[PDB]
Amino acid sequence: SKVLIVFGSSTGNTESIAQKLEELIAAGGHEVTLLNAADASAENLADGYDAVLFGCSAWGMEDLEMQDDFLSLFEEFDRIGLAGRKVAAFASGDQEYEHFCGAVPAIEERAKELGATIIAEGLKMEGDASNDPEAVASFAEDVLKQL
Numbered sequence: 001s002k003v004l005i006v007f008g009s010s011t012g013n014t015e016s017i018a019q020k021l022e023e024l025i026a027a028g029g030h031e032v033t034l035l036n037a038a039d040a041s042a043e044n045l046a047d048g049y050d051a052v053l054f055g056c057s058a059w060g061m062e063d064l065e066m067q068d069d070f071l072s073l074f075e076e077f078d079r080i081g082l083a084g085r086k087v088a089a090f091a092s093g094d095q096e097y098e099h100f101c102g103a104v105p106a107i108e109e110r111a112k113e114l115g116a117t118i119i120a121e122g123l124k125m126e127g128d129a130s131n132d133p134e135a136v137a138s139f140a141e142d143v144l145k146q147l
């Protein structure tokens with residue numbers, strides 16, 4: 001299958017998770033494309049892809065604010081071509097906050113509104129990929145099986 005992975009990462013934790021995810025799905029016999037949302041042109045970005053995974057950390061002093069490289073892409077979800085495609089979200093976050101990885105539910109809702117199907121429950125964890133390999137491995141499992 002063809003899998004597209006796009007992320008927005010400020011310190012590198014959501015990046016780390018998106019690279020591990022690329023490795024695990026690619027290992028399953030699938031073609032993975034990895035993009036930093038800061039580099040990606042949204043226009044028809046999903047065309048060709050059987051699933052699309054979105055990674056994005058949560059910030060904001062008060063309410064939830066998305067990582068800014070993702071956000072800019074989030075604005076353009078309308079042109080991506082998500083209708084009838086499979087999608088899932090992941091993120092790095094901090095339990096010590098009220099809205100743990102709040103970007104994840106947010107992505108899932110925008111995606112469903114645009115006609116996407118949610119493949120697996122959003123991955124929510126702390127630190128980089130090495131900090132919770134199980135959580136990463138399992139989320140990749142969930143994804144693989146829906147492909």
Ligand SMILES: Cc1cc2nc3c(=O)[nH]c(=O)nc-3n(C[C@H](O)[C@H](O)[C@H](O)COP(=O)(O)O)c2cc1C
Pocket residue numbers: 008009010011012013014015057058059060061064067092093094095097098099100101102
């Ligand atoms: C000011 C600020 C606000 C944050 N807010 C949240 C949040 O609300 N939810 C959450 O899970 N993590 C929150 N975090 C933790 C970061 O999301 C996480 O440590 C960081 O984004 C690592 O991901 P990244 O390196 O891929 O950017 C916050 C961090 C900073 C310092």
